[PDB]
Amino acid sequence: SHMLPRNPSMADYEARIFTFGTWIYSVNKEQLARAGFYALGEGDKVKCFHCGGGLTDWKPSEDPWEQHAKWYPGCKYLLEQKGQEYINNIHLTH
Ligand SMILES: CN[C@@H](C)C(=O)N[C@H](C(=O)N1CC[C@H](C)[C@H]1C(=O)Nc1ccccc1-c1ncccn1)C1CCCCC1
Ligand SMILES: [Zn+2]
What we know:
Elements: H1 13-18, H2 29-34, E1 37-39, E2 46-48, E3 54-55, H3 64-71, H4 76-81, H5 84-90
Antiparallel strand pairs: 1-2, 2-3
This protein binds ligand 9JZ and zinc ion.
Family: Belongs to the IAP family.
Protein name: E3 ubiquitin-protein ligase XIAP
Subcellular location: Cytoplasm; Nucleus
């Protein structure tokens, strides 16, 4: 939940989109990169450059931002981009 990104080398959106150059999975690569994720090159495993949170086993029609907020609500990239209200809404039911 720190304000300092875990992986500065992947802070650049262009650095992240590059990792998806040959992405074959259903979840949209631009949406993934915009949501802070880069591909690890091992199945559909991705990692956020900021919070360091990893996610795998993406399902059809899943939204990168929603999943990001669900699993890593303390991510400060998410807070900076989407804002707290977005995070609040994802966690509304619990
Ligand atoms: C359906 N949408 C996807 C994006 C999603 O929610 N992925 C989750 C995920 O990647 N998680 C959950 C938190 C965890 C830090 C991360 C993860 O890396 N999980 C694992 C990765 C490799 C090996 C095991 C796990 C794992 N182990 C125990 C419980 C959950 N995941 C998780 C994958 C396994 C089945 C439950 C869901
Ligand atoms: Zn994050």
